[PDB]
Design a binder for this molecule. Structure first.
Ligand SMILES: *[C@@H]1O[C@H](CO[C@@H]2O[C@@H](C)[C@@H](O)[C@@H](O)[C@@H]2O)[C@@H](O[C@@H]2O[C@H](CO)[C@@H](O[C@@H]3O[C@H](CO)[C@@H](O)[C@H](O[C@H]4O[C@H](CO)[C@@H](O)[C@H](O)[C@@H]4O)[C@@H]3O)[C@H](O)[C@H]2NC(C)=O)[C@H](O)[C@H]1NC(C)=O
Ligand SMILES: *[C@@H]1O[C@H](CO[C@@H]2O[C@@H](C)[C@@H](O)[C@@H](O)[C@@H]2O)[C@@H](O)[C@H](O)[C@H]1NC(C)=O
Ligand SMILES: *[C@@H]1O[C@H](CO)[C@@H](O)[C@H](O)[C@H]1NC(C)=O
Ligand SMILES: *[C@@H]1O[C@H](CO)[C@@H](O)[C@H](O)[C@H]1NC(C)=O
Ligand SMILES: *[C@@H]1O[C@H](CO)[C@@H](O)[C@H](O)[C@H]1NC(C)=O
Length: 523
C-alpha cells in the first residue's frame, strides 16, 4: 500500500467502510516541525526521509486550551483534541477510494475553532465515508492555533503573524506536488471548512499566492468579512505586547521579546493567552488572522469591494440557529440544563457581551428592531431574539454579503440554509439547529447504521454529500431532485436543507441584514 512522495515513501492502511474499502494515510508530515527557533515563524519546507513513514495513525494536535465549560458533557468535549498535544503537529491526512482512482476530485477540509482550538483528527471530520460514497479524495491538515499560530509583530520575521494560515497554504502546496501519486487531480481541488475554517477558505480566496493552489471553495457558517474574522495590524501588536506583559517577557527590544517567548513553555503561553482579550469567549479571537501585509494585504471588506479575489464558484451556507451555541458560553441566563428563558435585563447584558464598543442608543436600536418592532409576547421572545441577533450579525449576514460580492462580479454561487436538528444532538431543545452540527451530515456519519441515526438522516446525509461532491467536481451542486438554483445578485435564491423536502426561497434574513448594513453603522 506504499506510495512514494517527493520526500519519501509513506505507508497507509485499508479501512472497512460501508461494505467496501477506503485507503487512509494518517499523519503525513508536510512541514518542518516549528520547534525552538522556528516557533512563531512561518512553516519551513519538509525534509527528506530515506525510510518508510508509517502514516497509520492520527498525528499530534497543536497546542491549544481545551474546553472545560461543561465537564463530562459530550456535546462540548467532542470538539476537544483527541490526540496528544505537541508543537510538532504539522501533518495531514489523505483518504483514497478503493479501487484507486486516476483523476479524482480532491476536497481539502479546514477545521474551525475560533483560530484558538481544533484538530483534523476529530471523529466528525473523518473523511472515509465521503471518499467511499462520492469517490473523491479527502485531505485535511493540522495548523497552528492560538498565539503559537497567530502571534503577530508587524514586519518581524521572528513572529510575522498569520503563521497558521501559512501552515494551511503549505499543506495546499503539498497536495499540488504529491496528490497525483495517490490518484488525485491537482486541478480539481475544492476547499471546504466550517466557521474559522470557512474564514480560512475565504481568506485563501483573498490571498493571490493561494489562488493557483485550488479551484473552488465551500464556506460553512463563516466568511472572512465577519466582524470577528480579522484584526488590524496595530491591533495584533497590542495583543502580542499584552501577552508579553502577563507572561513576563516584556522588553524594549522587540526582536528579543520573541527570544524570551521561545524559551517559555507552551502550557505557560496558553495560560496567559486568555488574559489578552477583555473577555474570553468563542468569537473573541485573541490571536487570529491580521492584516499582515504578506498573506493578507487589506481588510477582507476592502478587497471584496475592489474585486481583488479569485474569480471562481463558491458554495456558501449557514445553519438555522447559529447564535445559540455562542450564548450558552457567556450570555447571562443561558444554560444547557434549562430552557434559558431570559429577561430584558439579561438580553441587554447579552448585547453588551457581543457588542463591546457600541453606545447605549446603539443597543436600543438592536433591541427595537429585534423585539419592539413586532408583537411577539411569548415567554421565549428575548431568548430567540438574542439567538437571531448574534446569528445574523456574526455569521449569517456577513456570509450573505460575501456571496453577494462574488455574484456582482459574475461568478456562480450557491447558498444553503441548513434546517435539520440531529436526533442524537446532546444539547437541549432551545438551542435548535446549532452551529457546527451540519458537519456530521457533510462527512456522512449517519450512513453508519450502527451509529443509530434515523433513516431519513442517512438519506439527508447522502443528499448533502452528493451536492458537496458535485460542486467540487463540476462546479454545480446538481436529475429529478429539487434543483439548487444559482444565487444571483438580483433574485438571491437559496435552498433549504432538511430531511423532509428542500425548498427554494429568496433574500434570506433580508430585513435583518438590511438593518446591520444600512442603519446600524449610523447609530
Ligand atoms: C437557567 O440556569 C442558569 C444557570 O444557573 C446555574 O445552572 C443551573 C443548571 C442550575 O444548577 C442553577 O442553580 C445554577 O445557578 C440560571 O442563571 C443563574 O441564576 C442564578 C440564580 O438562580 C444566578 O446566581 C445568583 O446571582 C446573583 C448575583 O450574583 C445573586 O443574587 C445570587 O447569590 C445570592 O443567592 C444565593 C442563592 O442562590 C446565595 O447562596 C448567595 O449567598 C447570595 O445570597 C446568585 O449567585 C446566576 O448568576 C445565573 N447565571 C447566569 C446569569 O449566567 C438561570 O436563572 C436558569 N433559568 C431558568 C429559567 O431556570
Ligand atoms: C510500519 O508498519 C509495518 C507493518 O505494520 C503492519 O501494517 C500496518 C499497515 C499496520 O496495520 C500495523 O498495525 C501492522 O502491524 C511494521 O512492520 C513496521 O515496523 C512499521 N514501522 C515502524 C517504523 O514502526
Ligand atoms: C486530469 O484532468 C486534467 C484536467 O482537469 C488533465 O489535464 C489531466 O491530463 C487529467 N489526467 C491525469 C492527470 O491523468
Ligand atoms: C492596547 O490598547 C489599549 C487601548 O487604549 C491601550 O490602553 C493599551 O496601553 C495598549 N496595550 C499595550 C500597548 O500593550
Ligand atoms: C442502537 O439501537 C439499537 C436498538 O436495538 C441498540 O441495540 C443499540 O445498542 C443502539 N446503539 C448502537 C451504538 O448501536
Amino acid at each position: 500500500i506504499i506510495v512514494t512522495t517527493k520526500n519519501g515513501k509513506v505507508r497507509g492502511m485499508n479501512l472497512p467502510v460501508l461494505g467496501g474499502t477506503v485507503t487512509a494515510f494518517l499523519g503525513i508530515p508536510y512541514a518542518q516541525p516549528p520547534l525552538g527557533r522556528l516557533r512563531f515563524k512561518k512553516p519551513q519546507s519538509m525534509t527528506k526521509w530515506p525510510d518508510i513513514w508509517n502514516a497509520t495513525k492520527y498525528a499530534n494536535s497543536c497546542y491549544q486550551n481545551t474546553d472545560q465549560s461543561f465537564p463530562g458533557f459530550v456535546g462540548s468535549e467532542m470538539w476537544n483534541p483527541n490526540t496528544e498535544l505537541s508543537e510538532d503537529c504539522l501533518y495531514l491526512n489523505v483518504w483514497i477510494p478503493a479501487p484507486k482512482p486516476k483523476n479524482a476530485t480532491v476536497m481539502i477540509w479546514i477545521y474551525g475553532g475560533g483560530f484558538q482550538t481544533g484538530t483534523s483528527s476529530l471523529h466528525v471530520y473523518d473523511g472515509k465515508f465521503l471518499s467511499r460514497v462520492e469517490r473523491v479524495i479527502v485531505v485535511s491538515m493540522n495548523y497552528r492555533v492560538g498565539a503559537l499560530g497567530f502571534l503577530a509583530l508587524p514586519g518581524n520575521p521572528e513572529a510575522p503573524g498569520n503563521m497558521g494560515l501559512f501552515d494551511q497554504q503549505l499543506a495546499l502546496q503539498w497536495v499540488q506536488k504529491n496528490i497525483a501519486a495517490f490518484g488525485g487531480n491537482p486541478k480539481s481541488v475544492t476547499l471546504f471548512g466550517e466557521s474559522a475554517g470557512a474564514v480560512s477558505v475565504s481568506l485563501h480566496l483573498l490571498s493571490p499566492r493561494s489562488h493557483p493552489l485550488f479551484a473552488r471553495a465551500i464556506l460553512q457558517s463563516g466568511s472572512s468579512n465577519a466582524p470577528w474574522a480579522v484584526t488590524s495590524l496595530y491591533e495584533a501588536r497590542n495583543r502580542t505586547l499584552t501577552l508579553a506583559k502577563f507572561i513576563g517577557c516584556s522588553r524594549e527590544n522587540e526582536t528579543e521579546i520573541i527570544k524570551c517567548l521561545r524559551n517559555k513553555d507552551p502550557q505557560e503561553i496558553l495560560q496567559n493567552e486568555v488574559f489578552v482579550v477583555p473577555n474570553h469567549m468563542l468569537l473573541s479571537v485573541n490571536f487570529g488572522p491580521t492584516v499582515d501585509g504578506d498573506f493578507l494585504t487589506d481588510l477582507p471588506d476592502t478587497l471584496l469591494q475592489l474585486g481583488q479575489f479569485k474569480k471562481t464558484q463558491i458554495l456558501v451556507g449557514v445553519n438555522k440557529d447559529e447564535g445559540t451555541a455562542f450564548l450558552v458560553y457567556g450570555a447571562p441566563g443561558f444554560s444547557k440544563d434549562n430552557n434559558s428563558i431570559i429577561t430584558r435585563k439579561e438580553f441587554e447584558e447579552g448585547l453588551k457581551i457581543f457588542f463591546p464598543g457600541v453606545s447605549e442608543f446603539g443597543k436600543e436600536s438592536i433591541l427595537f428592531h429585534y423585539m419592539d418592532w413586532t408583537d411577539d409576547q411569548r415567554a421565549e421572545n428575548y431568548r430567540d431574539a438574542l439567538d437571531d441577533v448574534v446569528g445574523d450579525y456574526d455569521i449569517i449576514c456577513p456570509a450573505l454579503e460575501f456571496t453577494k460580492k462574488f455574484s456582482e462580479m459574475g461568478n456562480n454561487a450557491f447558498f444553503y440554509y441548513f434546517e435539520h436538528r440531529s436526533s442524537k444532538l446532546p444539547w437541549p431543545e432551545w438551542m435548535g439547529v446549532m452551529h457546527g452540527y451540519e458537519i456530521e451530515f457533510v462527512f456522512g456519519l449517519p450512513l453508519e447504521r450502527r451509529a443509530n441515526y434515523t433513516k431519513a438522516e442517512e438519506i439527508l446525509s447522502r443528499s448533502i454529500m452528493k451536492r458537496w461532491a458535485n460542486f467540487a467536481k463540476y462546479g454545480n451542486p446538481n436529475n429529478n431532485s429539487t434543483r439548487w438554483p444559482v444565487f444571483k445578485s438580483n433574485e438571491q435564491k437559496y435552498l433549504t436543507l432538511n430531511a423532509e423536502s428542500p425548498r427554494v426561497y429568496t433574500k434570506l434574513r433580508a430585513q435583518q441584514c438590511r438593518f446591520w448594513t444600512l442603519f446600524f453603522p449610523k447609530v
